[PDB]
Paper text:
NDM-1, as a typical member of B1 class of MBLs, possesses two Zn(II) ions intercalated by a nucleophile hydroxide in its active site, which is delimited by flexible loop 3 and 1023. The Zn(II) ion in the active site of MCR-1 has been validated to be vital for the PEA transfer process; notwithstanding its biological roles in MCR proteins are still controversial.
Since AUR is a prodrug and metabolizes to an active species [Au(PEt3)]+ when transferred across cell membranes, we therefore used an AUR analogue, chloro(triethylphosphine)gold(I) [Au(PEt3)Cl], for all the enzyme-based biophysical studies to mimic its action in cellulo. From the density map, three Au ions were clearly visible in one chain in an asymmetric unit, and a single Au ion (Au542 with occupancy of 0.5) was found in the Zn-dependent catalytic core, coordinating with four residues, i.e., Glu246, Asp465, His466, and TPO285 to form a distorted tetrahedral geometry. The second Au ion (Au543) linearly coordinated to Nɛ2-His252 and PEt3 group (N–Au–P angle 171.5°). The third Au ion (Au544) coordinated to Nɛ2-His424 and a water molecule in a quasi-linear geometry (N–Au–O angle of 159.0°). The crystallographic analysis demonstrates that AUR binds to MCR-1 and displaces Zn(II) in the active site through Au(I). We show that the Zn(II) ions in MCR-1 could be irreversibly kicked out by AUR and form an Au-bound MCR-1 with Au(I) coordinating to Glu246, Asp465, His466, and TPO285.
Residue numbers in the entry: 219 to 541
Write the structure that this text describes.
């Protein structure tokens, strides 16, 4: 392991103040320009709009355009300019640091896996929610596809087992992951119709493609809102907060480009312009940065450290999502 945060210290501990419980939703394939709050022509995010204390960040750029590239960068100390995907697995990352300081780290996954991020930590702290062995919400659609909302089921038991400790829970979403946007949501979120149902996105009627994509966003709005609602049930005993950031955007036929993964050197804007949301309870003392702060995935690591009152010289000056 190559360390950059051996100086990390927690200024206040959970035995001397309210313990902190945070959910970080690691989003998948969501575009900033398809969010209602960013100026989109459709109400793709209605449930989040009914919750007080949610900050929408209108200017967030992802480290890259693929899950394998972006996800390790999101938890890196190095920042996008110095990040190396091929050696990321051997670097101390922000979750290693928090775990060493006693924060209880949980990673649930309905996407694929942590892309290296969890590899140094006990495997018991990673759980696969793509399979019904763990996910109880798969039989809600004709595909028997495990849903993101299934990752909230049983978190109270996790909280009960970590009673009184600081907790950081990562929920790695399937979210809008393609090309089969139409399989990413249940019938209740099929509001924009008709929808594209083929793997050849270029042959699908363009409007029908956008419709399927936006319906999947409604399913993600629902999931994020339910994550906040779950946190709201522990607001008296814990300082609760929720961070959402998508790993990268998506092309939907602009200049003939579909799906994601374009090399950063010529990646279109829509593959790197991502939504981010931050929610916190009024008691936590956490203050969001301005909604239009120029932000990137580099802000995630300092946000997570600040949420748990942790300092580290490597990201001392780095802009975060919160003050
Ligand atoms: Au669009
Ligand atoms: Au992704
Ligand atoms: Au179109």
């Amino acid at each position: 392991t190559i360390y950059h945060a051996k100086d990390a210290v927690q200024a206040t501990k959970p035995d001397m103040r309210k313990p902190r419980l945070v959910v970080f939703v690691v989003g998948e394939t969501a575009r900033a320009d398809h969010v209602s709050f960013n100026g989109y022509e459709r109400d793709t995010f209605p449930q989040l709009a009914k919750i007080d204390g949610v900050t929408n960040f209108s200017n967030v750029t992802s480290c890259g355009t693929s899950t394998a590239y972006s996800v390790p960068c999101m938890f890196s100390y190095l920042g996008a300019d110095e990040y190396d995907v091929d050696t990321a697995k051997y670097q101390e990352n922000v979750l290693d640091t928090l775990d060493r300081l006693g924060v209880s780290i949980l990673w649930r996954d309905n996407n694929s896996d942590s892309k290296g991020v969890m590899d140094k930590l006990p495997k018991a702290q990673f759980a696969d929610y793509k399979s019904a062995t763990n996910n109880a919400i798969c039989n809600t659609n004709p595909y028997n596809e495990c849903r993101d909302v299934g990752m909230l089921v049983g978190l109270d038991d996790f909280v009960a087992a970590n009673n009184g400790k600081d907790m950081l829970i990562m929920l790695h979403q399937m979210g809008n992951h393609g090309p089969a946007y139409f399989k990413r949501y249940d019938e209740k979120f099929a509001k924009f119709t008709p929808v594209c149902e083929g793997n050849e996105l270029a042959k699908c009627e363009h409007q029908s493609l956008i419709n399927a994509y936006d319906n999947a966003l409604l399913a993600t709005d629902d999931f994020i809102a339910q994550s906040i609602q779950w946190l709201q049930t522990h607001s008296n005993a814990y300082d609760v907060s929720m961070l959402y950031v998508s790993d990268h955007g998506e092309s939907l036929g602009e200049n003939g480009v579909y799906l994601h993964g374009m090399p950063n050197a010529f990646a279109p804007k829509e593959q790197r312009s991502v939504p981010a949301f931050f929610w916190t309870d009024k008691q936590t003392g956490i203050t969001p940065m301005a909604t239009d702060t120029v932000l990137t995935h580099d802000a995630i690591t300092p946000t997570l450290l600040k949420l748990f009152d942790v300092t580290a010289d490597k990201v001392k000056d780095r802009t975060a999502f919160i003050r």
